[PDB]
């Protein structure tokens, strides 16, 4: 057909280049990566069921490089153009996260690949927030922010050319893809020289730290780059030793044998200077578990809400031991047995033909049902890994405004997970001659 490289390959290259750039900017991220590699190796050696799970699903091959980035943009035009940038790399907008409820003036989506085979090549995602200026109730401050943002140009001209070329021609060859990665990366580099005076920076920063982080800098620098660990409890035990003491409160469900959604915590990664005069860069670590169905999401939200009620306040470091204890107690009601998670329809799964099943594929007399094939060892299942982010604690005007700015509708992650599960069952049926 042509000599264009796969968008998935460009995404893997971009993720790797972002990681190297960020490590140069933020040395403690490199320290974290060394700790993640050690923890993940220990889990695989000590927990054969985890090793097997990751082999069945192919995640063992993607795990070591698996990351997400987080960025913030300031204008609708920036969001729409960044969607085009990410589309070069096979990344589509999935989900919608509105923090206007929680008092933070942003709403967001995550750009990611959508199909398990693409995700296998690279599961890189970029959580992308758009600052909302209407929620600023000091008119002169809103005007200042709008004027500063209006005239900045966060994309290099060469990046924009290669985005347009990709769209018109249907892809990029290896040399143009390499140029694209380098040009795109410039958008996300740290720049110490602010675009505002110290006075302006002060007024923006007291309105909300996030407003200054967006408006005062030349572009959308990396807010964090998060590697994936197989055991966030283990990494937390190793992180004080390395000078990145994390928040004791871990976001997400408590420890489980069969994790759900994700768990995450944060740490201070670097004190930076801003020139017109200091600002912190924070890091993050995450552990990714099973994607939940609508039913599972409803149960999750209910138990998390009950934990917060029992806490009597806001989860903070001062109450961390008590919070974590209440979280475990309340989440006892979420089944922690994979068979029940499947039978009760709480999580999405992938199904695989086993060696035993394949060897029996020409037999009559085999079990006539999916459960019967599982029971006889012909089909094996594992949870489908969650690719998205924790929901905002909980009509459509905000999502509609976001989608108008984005230039398309966000994809429904639950529909995408259902499709992954279905494709696995179809592939298993073909492999087993059913
Ligand atoms: Ni994050």
Residue numbers in the entry: 3 to 278, 287 to 404, 422 to 461
Lines quoted from the article behind this entry:
In this step, 2OA is converted to D-2-hydroxyglutarate (2HG) in a reaction catalyzed by the Fe(II)-dependent DUF1338 family enzyme hydroxyglutarate synthase (HglS). Homologs of this enzyme are broadly distributed across multiple domains of life, including nearly every sequenced plant genome. Conversion of 2OA directly to D-2HG requires two discrete chemical steps, a decarboxylation and hydroxylation, making the chemical mechanism of the enzyme puzzling. We further show that despite very low sequence identity, plant homologs also catalyze the conversion of 2OA to 2HG and adopt the same structural fold as the bacterial enzyme, suggesting that DUF1338 family proteins catalyze the last unknown step of plant lysine catabolism.
To better understand the unusual HglS reaction, we obtained crystal structures of the enzyme both with and without a bound substrate. Initially, Hg1S was crystallized without substrate, and the Hg1S structure was solved at 1.1 Å resolution. Further analysis also revealed the presence of a metal cofactor bound within a conserved metal cofactor-binding motif—consisting of the residues His 70, His 226, and Glu 294—common to the DUF1338 structures. HglS and HMS structure comparison revealed the two enzymes share a similar central β-sheet fold common to the DUF1338 structures. To determine metal cofactor identity within the HglS structure, we conducted a fluorescent scan of a HglS crystal. We detected a photon emission near 7475 eV, the K-alpha emission of nickel. In addition, a less intense peak corresponding to the K-alpha emission of iron was also observed. We therefore assigned the co-crystallized metal as Ni(II) with a small percent Fe(II) occupancy. While the metal cofactors present in the HMS and HglS structures differ, we previously determined that HglS utilizes Fe(II), not Ni(II), for catalysis. The nickel bound to HglS is likely derived from the nickel affinity chromatography protein purification.
